[PDB]
Amino acid sequence: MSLYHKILIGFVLGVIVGLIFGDKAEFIKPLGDIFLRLLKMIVVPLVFSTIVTGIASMGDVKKLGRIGAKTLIYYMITTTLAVTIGLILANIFKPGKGLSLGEIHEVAHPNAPSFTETLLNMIPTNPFEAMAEGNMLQIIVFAIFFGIALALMGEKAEPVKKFFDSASEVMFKITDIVMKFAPYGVFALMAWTVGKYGLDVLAPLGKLILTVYLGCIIHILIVYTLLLRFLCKINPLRFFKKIKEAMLVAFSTCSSAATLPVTMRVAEELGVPESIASFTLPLGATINMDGTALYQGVAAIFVAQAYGVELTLGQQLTIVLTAVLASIGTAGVPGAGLVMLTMVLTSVGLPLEGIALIAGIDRILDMARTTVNVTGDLVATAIVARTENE
């Protein structure tokens, strides 16, 4: 009767229904879309309110600096490690061998924005413009500025501080209201996915699917589990038990941004103080996408093998860096990781025709990479809290 089991029951029964009815399972697809829309509804107001309240409640900008620096460095390190693992596993298994489809028809798309332009785009020219377009990074930057101001403004900031502190709680309550619909939404999503993706579609790229899932599992049990058990002295089996809801929601939804409310809600029961969680989770939700980096590395290697091109060491490292940047730039919307794969492939010069190969089964890989992305945020929160005085 506990909410998590209800979500689990919905998940399992949706899988069963999709297996039974197959293609016909799309009929129930709209029900899942309602759940996704409801989850998306909460993100932006929740993100802004939580960031502002967390920074304001901390009341120490100097403390904020340490947390931000450590979180950013950890995100970068985990992302590079994830892409490295992806490359290693892709080389070991060679998913793209025994396959060659389509010509190298035409040159790829040039003129992607430079590194400098993306950094300049993180500051909004109009905060309401950022809010309206749902640009997460701009909203987060403005919220950080607002929180610092409130933390330093002092007595005169009490009205704004209290208003946003209450607004964050209101958004959490709204999230709790939505979760009553979570099991049915997950059921519908699983039914749709399983029914749509029949055995025939997966078998041609079964080795690619296995490589991606194995990479995600290896990341979870080697990077996160170690950083919990060896460094933070946290029993990983209890950690994942407490996190389970967020992992399952991310797996079913394939949307880190839409999963953020569940992640934030779960983080409060994790034990980390709310001040660090509020700042870190929104940032990692769009900056920390280690699962995306691993998936992008694996897909790039698969595409390279699909057309006989074997990369030199320099090319593989360029994949490391470009995949890190792409994961940084990827948004938390399903299918985003595949779209950004153009930025990675173009760097090495691999044909973009390979994307057509992945575009079919993409959702099955999106599930795993989104699960890893969501888990990474909570693991980072726990580690940062442990590094400070938890």
What is the contact surface with ligand ASP in residues (CB under 6 A)? 254-256, 289, 292, 295, 330, 332, 334-337, 366, 369-370, 373
The kind and range of the H/E element at 59 are: none
With respect to ligand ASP, which residue has the nearer C-beta, 275 or 371? 371
With respect to ligand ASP, which residue has the nearer C-beta, 49 or 373? 373
The answer to whether residues 276 and 66 touch, using CB atoms and an 8 Å cutoff, is no
Closest CA to 45 of 147, 152, 132: 132
Cβ 374 to ligand ASP shortest distance, Å: 7
Can you point out the beta strands (E) in 196-302?
A: none
Cβ 56 to ligand ASP shortest distance, Å: 28
Closest CA to 16 of 241, 230, 224, 187: 187
Cβ 40 to ligand ASP shortest distance, Å: 11
- Tokens for 272? 């980390």
Cβ 301 to ligand ASP shortest distance, Å: 16
The rounded Cα 58 to chain-centroid distance in angstroms is 26
With respect to ligand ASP, which residue has the nearer C-beta, 90 or 232? 90
With respect to ligand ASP, which residue has the nearer C-beta, 350 or 372? 372
Cβ 333 to ligand ASP shortest distance, Å: 6
Cβ 185 to ligand ASP shortest distance, Å: 16
Cβ 169 to ligand ASP shortest distance, Å: 26
> In 94-153, which residue ranges form alpha helices assigned H by DSSP?
115-120, 127-133, 136-153
Q: Could you tell me the CA-to-CA distances from 321 to 75, 80, 234, 345, 376 in Å, in that order? A: 14, 8, 31, 12, 19
With respect to ligand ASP, which residue has the nearer C-beta, 53 or 256? 256
The answer to whether residues 190 and 252 touch, using CB atoms and an 8 Å cutoff, is yes
Q: Which residue is nearest to ligand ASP (CB)?
A: 337
Cβ 362 to ligand ASP shortest distance, Å: 8
With respect to ligand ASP, which residue has the nearer C-beta, 249 or 384? 249
Cβ 107 to ligand ASP shortest distance, Å: 25
The rounded Cα 215 to chain-centroid distance in angstroms is 15
**Residue written as token pair 């964050």:** 168
With respect to ligand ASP, which residue has the nearer C-beta, 53 or 255? 255
With respect to ligand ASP, which residue has the nearer C-beta, 135 or 275? 135
With respect to ligand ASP, which residue has the nearer C-beta, 227 or 365? 365
DSSP secondary structure letters along 156-192: GGHHHHHHHHHHHHHHHHHHHHHHTTHHHHHHHHHHH
The answer to whether residues 301 and 348 touch, using CB atoms and an 8 Å cutoff, is no
306 burial level (CB within 10 Å; 0-12, 13-18, 19+): buried
Cβ atoms within 10 Å, residue 81: 17
